[PDB]
Ligand binder design. Structure first.
Ligand code: HEM
Ligand code: HEM
Lengths: 145, 145
């Protein structure tokens, strides 16, 4: 239940999400591409889903990948801004869930983003505490897939 | 090209876009839904394109419409944040252009959003000068359609 999952975002979890987002969200292009390249490097079996982006190994040089990556960061910005109201968080999460359901992305595969998030956070000195907080947010999307 | 349309956005235009967005972008749920409902009221012929959202006459109560509207405002947030780097603005604009091209939305049809934007801007007392500035930003997207 996406609603029960949203209920797991306690005061402490929301605080850690906001605090870390303040840093990671400051460079959407840089960290956005970092997230995607890490996903492709650690889970090569997911590259096939991104055929529209062309050669993803080009990273920042790939205009389609850069556009996609920046936009992805605004989806996270959206989630963070909706933390105050569970009803609004759920409706935006379901909107993005549909985008992935159409691309045939399951809850299990969506969860493969946790590894990359932990790595990007770690490179900014945010440890497991923050990685686990973000895993709870990702879990809300997984509940809608 | 799209680059040309973006590179032509002057300092004065960017100033008006940012100043007005500070206001209309401050209430994404409220102004986002207002934009969509106004589009449906003045351009009823577009209602059919949004069948995935269900009964759009339900307004704010429609969770699918609310989720869509909030997300639309983040696409605008994206554009506004990329104003000073045409290269980044272009790649994000082309990304969203693809979303509409797949939905069979022509450049002329995309331009129908100018009416709703002008009305929402006016509701906050931003006049024709601001409506003209936004029309120039919409024109960047039209260059990709
Ligand atoms: C933090 C997690 C993630 C977020 C917030 C996110 C966000 C997004 C956004 C905003 C889009 C654009 C939707 C559109 O306009 O069609 C997108 C597209 C896509 N996402 Fe994700 N995504 C995430 C994780 C993943 C993962 C882990 C996979 C795959 C294992 C995945 C697969 C896809 C695919 C295949 C597309 C379509 C790309 C294209 O053809 O343009 N996403 N995602
Ligand atoms: C300020 C201008 C506009 C912006 C920034 C914008 C933004 C968006 C965004 C972000 C999406 C979601 C993309 C996706 O996840 O697939 C979307 C979907 C869509 N847009 Fe727009 N849009 C604008 C104007 C228009 C206009 C004027 C029309 C119609 C004449 C239109 C028709 C559509 C349609 C049919 C969809 C698909 C909705 C669905 O089935 O989920 N858009 N738009």
């Amino acid at each position: 239940s996406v609603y029960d999952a949203a209920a797991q975002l306690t005061a402490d979890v929301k605080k850690d999400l906001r605090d870390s987002w303040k840093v990671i969200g400051s460079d959407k292009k840089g960290n956005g591409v970092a997230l995607m390249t890490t996903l492709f490097a650690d889970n090569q079996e997911t590259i096939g889903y991104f055929k529209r982006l062309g050669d993803v190994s080009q990273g920042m040089a790939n205009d389609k990948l850069r556009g996609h990556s920046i936009t992805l960061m605004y989806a996270l910005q959206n989630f963070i801004d909706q933390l105050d109201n569970p009803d609004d968080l759920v409706c935006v999460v379901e909107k993005f869930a549909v985008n992935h359901i159409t691309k045939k992305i399951s809850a299990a595969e969506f969860g493969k983003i946790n590894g990359p998030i932990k790595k990007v956070l770690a490179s900014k000195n945010f440890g497991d505490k923050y990685a686990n907080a973000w895993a709870k947010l990702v879990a809300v999307v997984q509940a809608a897939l």
